[PDB]
Structures are given as structure tokens and as C-alpha cells.
Design an enzyme around this catalytic site. Structure first.
Site, mmCIF file in Angstrom:
data_model
loop_
_atom_site.group_PDB
_atom_site.id
_atom_site.type_symbol
_atom_site.label_atom_id
_atom_site.label_comp_id
_atom_site.label_asym_id
_atom_site.label_seq_id
_atom_site.Cartn_x
_atom_site.Cartn_y
_atom_site.Cartn_z
ATOM 1 N N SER A 273 14.473 25.862 108.106
ATOM 2 C CA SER A 273 13.396 26.061 109.060
ATOM 3 C C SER A 273 13.378 27.562 109.412
ATOM 4 C CB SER A 273 13.599 25.133 110.265
ATOM 5 O OG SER A 273 12.597 25.323 111.254
ATOM 6 N N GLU B 224 9.024 24.834 101.552
ATOM 7 C CA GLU B 224 8.814 23.580 102.248
ATOM 8 C C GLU B 224 8.118 23.901 103.569
ATOM 9 O OE1 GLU B 224 10.339 22.095 105.329
ATOM 10 O OE2 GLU B 224 11.097 24.112 105.899
ATOM 11 N N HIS C 161 11.873 19.150 105.883
ATOM 12 C CA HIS C 161 11.927 18.546 107.228
ATOM 13 C C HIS C 161 11.922 17.013 107.285
ATOM 14 C CE1 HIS C 161 11.168 22.595 108.668
ATOM 15 N NE2 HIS C 161 11.456 22.151 109.884
#
Lengths: 294, 294
Positions: free
Chosen positions: A109, A204, A272
Site C-alpha cells: 500500500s 495493484e 488488497h
């Protein structure tokens, strides 16, 4: 078996360089680390709050630097991503970090920004779950969390991946990337993505409409030497609402990969969702057959 | 003197183009009827009704219309129909020589169009930050729409502001900026904000939680010579939900302006709400007391 942790040799430093942590999630995390016999060092400001950030830049920098001062630390596992770790980049004492014994930095992230900066400075890192993932398909989540200790021990060295269109080929280069939005949001700054020639760019994301993903991709690819990449390798795009858009996300990404004449891969179990298997950030890997191998 | 709702005549022909998001047919029709009510002669680009996902046609189609707006000899303004997303995509293929060769014809718009306004300023071409033309086809709103013709005619010279932080001395420099998110999304690219020393950086946004605004602000300021700006002047931040965040938006922007040692103003009637008064993009302006003047 993939739910089985490996012992972590030495001690794990826990730090919170981005978003603030809920007290109950922190305590639940520590209890799970203890279940697994993981010896840890808790950063002294991990419970700090400064709006949504885990303390001021100065507090977060103190904890990150301290993680590199202690001799028994063998890994630095970021507690939470969210937003804020790029803020630390103008304050980091890189020399003090190269001088410490190797201790891979772990997260995903927003932490992608620090992974990239670490790779630029020759420091080891791992793209994988943040440690509060322990304190929150459940089988997939558990395998993902176990994958960190397993990679630190060197006992996992591949992930499955599919080639999207194109032709059969073998691509070898440094593994870079992570969260598309976070990395795009560093373009034009000292924390822009480190993207050496031949690299395999993993991407991602989560929680974005398709136009925001395209905008981010355009920016990221315009800001690096995109035509010299080895490949683009998609992990998951979860909770990204299509909202009547005429083109699939893979059609959009495919158009960009075609424009820069780089092959496109997808379905890497990274991101995620429940599937977030660790991979070594900045190492040479090979896209061959049906896998990514290091 | 005239009421702020009173338009000024526009002589010659206004080129209508769609360099970003696609246009709804009914909104387009209502737009054209309002132009006709005001005696404005217009030309629609050949591709303004094109769709390619959410974009108003391909890059090639939009470039054809933009270039054509500069090839036609009787065009005196180029009024962008909609922002949204996509005009930065035109920058790699834009023929600046062709634009510069044409007689003066200010480019008008806001939101994503900020990206093109900035690029026009870099190339010494006139521009206006104000309503996109489809705003016509949808009292403060009417004043905002009228302000475009009034500014083209040169009769308006000031907007209200309020000092918020930093020194209170006069600031004089080029008016730059617009939408914070759209401009942050060009950092690190050929379309990055043109931000010469001494500029007054106007910022507005819509629909963002505070952490996303901060992330964009940190990127934009880190990506330019922020410390050499003359000032930051905030427009509106419309529908930007605070959601229990402990710091106000004024506190966050204050902290950033203080960090770069640049004065901070706010309440400029510019943005995504009812108040979107036109201002001359790239023109020298003076910020002093409770007014911005040019």
C-alpha cells in the site's frame, strides 16, 4: 504448507511510518506475533496520532532510525500503510541505514513508496502484508500473513502469474512497484519510483474508479523510462467500481502496455484482497511459463 | 457599469472543443441554445460528440479538434466544453508552433483543463480559468457564466479574497494553478505545472477526503519550486468531507504554506460550487488586503 510460519531469527522492529493505528488492532497484532514466537521491538511512537498520521514526521523518523540502530533487528515490519510514509523521505539518514546489518523493510500500500526508496539506496525490502493484518478467504489471508516469515527465511521463491495477450517470452529484471496510486502520487518528487531498465513493474490498487486508475497509470508511465521496462505485472484491483465504463480495466491497462511495447501479465496474488503473498522488492526475478520466480 | 449577470458581446467565433471527458447530447444542445441567446457565434469541433470510454474520443480525435481551433482564422476564443479527465493526454502530440502561429484566442476552462491552461502559459499563450462551456447547458452560477465574456472583453479586474496565514505584504506575480488533484496528477511529466518564481498559486478542489488533498498538496509543492512562490490562494473545496479528521482544512493548508514560507489567502470565488468567477491565467496579478487584482 503455506499457513505454516517459519521462525524469524533475531528480532522484528515494528514501526508506523504512515497512518495511525487503532489501539485494539495494535494489541491484537502483538498477541498474534507472540503466538508465533516472534520477538519484537515496538517503536516508541507507534501509538502517536497527528490527524490521520501516526505522529509527526519527526516522531516517525525517530522510530524508523531507531529500528536501524539496534543490532539484533533482522526485519522492520511496517504496522500500517494508508498515507504518509513519503513524508519521511526528506528526513531519512540513508548512511545510517546502509551501515546497519541487513533488515528487510516490509509492507505494501503506501509503504510501496518506502520500498522503492530503499531499493534506490541498495537496501533490502519486501512487498507484503503490513503487520496489523494480524490483528483484524480467511485461509488465503492467513497464508498471506505467513508468507512474510517464510520469505525472510528464504523458503518461498515463486508466485503464479498469467501472461495477458502478446506472445511467449522470458522476462528477467528487478521487481519494483506496488500500489499504483501511492507511487503515482510521488512522481515529480524525491520519492518517485526507482525503475531501472528491464524492471518488472508490479501494480495493484484498491478503492478507485477506472478514470482515476488510468490517470495514475498515465502519470506513472510518463514519469519513468517506461519503454525500457521488462514487463508490467498486475496484481489485484479490488473494490474498484466499474460504474458503466465501456472498457474493462484489463483493456485499459493493455492499451498502455501496447503503447510502450512492453508485455502485460496479470493475476499475481498480490494486493488488497485476501491474496497478498510476499515478494522480494528490488531483486532480479524471471517471468517464465506460468510463474514469477526469484 | 453593469450587473455581474450581464454578458458582454463576444466578437468573432468561439471554437468549442472537448479535450477531456465526453459530452452528454442534451447538455450540449442546451449549451448551444444559451450561446445563441447571447448572440455568440460558435464552431463545434468535428469530434466533440466522440466517446472512447469516458474520454471525448481518442487522443488523435481530440488533437485534431484542438489543432483545428488554431487553424481556423476567425476564431477569437477556444472554450473547452467539459473537464473531468483527459486533456493531459494531448500534450505529447500537441504542435505548439501551430498554436503560436495563430492570432490570439484565449483557451477557457477549469478542473482537468487546468493542465492545458498551465501548458498554454508555459508557451506564452493566453488562457482563462473559469467555467467550462457545458456549465451553460445545465444567481451566483449565472454571474460565474457571464464572467467569461466579461473577462474576454477586459471589463472585470478583481476578485475578493481573505488573508489566512503568513506575511501580509503585497504579492505580485503570475496567476497559476486551478484544480489541485488534476495538477498533482501531472507532476513528474511533460505537463507538470508551470510555476515560475513569484507566482500566485490558486488551488481549488471537489469531492476529496482530507488525506487525499494532503497527498496531492505534498506532491504538488515538492514537485515545483514552492519556496519561490509569491503566494497560495485558495478557492473553494466543495463537497470535501471532513469525516471526524482532527485538523481543519485551513489548518492543514496553513501548515503547508508555513513550511514553504509562502503567504496563504482563501475565499477566492473560484471552484466547483456556484461561485466560479473567471480569472486570467498566466497574467500578472496583485494580491493585497481583501482583493486579487489584475
Amino acid at each position: 504448507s503455506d499457513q505454516t510460519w517459519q521462525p524469524i531469527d533475531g528480532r522484528v522492529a515494528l514501526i508506523a511510518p504512515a497512518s495511525a493505528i487503532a489501539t485494539e488492532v495494535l494489541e491484537a497484532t502483538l498477541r498474534q506475533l507472540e503466538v508465533h514466537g516472534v520477538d519484537y521491538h515496538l517503536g516508541r511512537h507507534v501509538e502517536a496520532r497527528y490527524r490521520y498520521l501516526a505522529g509527526t514526521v519527526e516522531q516517525r523518523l525517530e522510530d524508523l532510525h531507531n529500528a536501524f540502530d539496534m543490532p539484533d533487528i533482522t526485519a522492520v515490519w511496517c504496522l500500517r500503510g494508508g498515507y504518509g510514509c513519503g513524508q519521511l523521505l526528506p528526513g531519512l539518514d540513508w548512511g545510517r541505514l546502509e551501515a546497519a546489518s541487513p533488515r528487510p523493510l516490509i509492507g505494501f500500500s503506501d509503504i510501496s513508496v518506502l520500498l522503492s526508496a530503499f531499493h534506490r539506496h541498495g537496501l533490502p525490502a519486501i512487498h507484503g502484508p503490513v503487520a496489523t493484518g494480524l490483528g483484524l478467504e480467511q485461509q488465503e489471508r492467513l497464508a498471506s500473513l505467513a508468507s512474510v516469515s517464510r520469505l525472510l527465511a528464504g523458503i518461498d521463491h515463486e508466485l503464479p502469474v498469467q501472461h495477458l495477450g502478446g506472445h511467449k517470452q522470458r522476462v528477467e529484471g528487478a521487481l519494483i512497484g506496488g500500489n499504483l496510486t501511492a507511487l503515482a502520487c510521488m512522481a515529480g518528487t524525491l520519492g518517485g519510483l526507482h525503475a531501472p531498465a528491464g524492471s518488472i513493474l508490479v501494480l495493484e490498487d484498491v478503492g478507485e474508479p477506472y478514470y482515476r486508475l488510468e490517470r495514475s497509470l498515465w502519470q506513472l508511465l510518463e514519469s519513468i523510462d517506461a519503454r525500457q521496462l521488462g514487463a508490467i505485472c498486475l496484481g489485484s484491483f479490488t473494490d474498484c467500481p466499474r460504474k458503466e465504463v465501456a472498457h474493462s480495466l484489463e483493456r485499459i491497462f493493455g492499451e498502455y502496455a501496447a503503447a510502450i511495447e512492453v508485455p502485460l501479465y496479470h493475476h499475481l496474488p498480490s494486493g488488497h484482497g485476501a491474496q497478498n503473498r510476499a515478494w522480494p522488492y528490488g531483486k532480479t526475478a524471471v517471468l517464465e511459463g506460468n510463474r514469477l520466480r526469484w
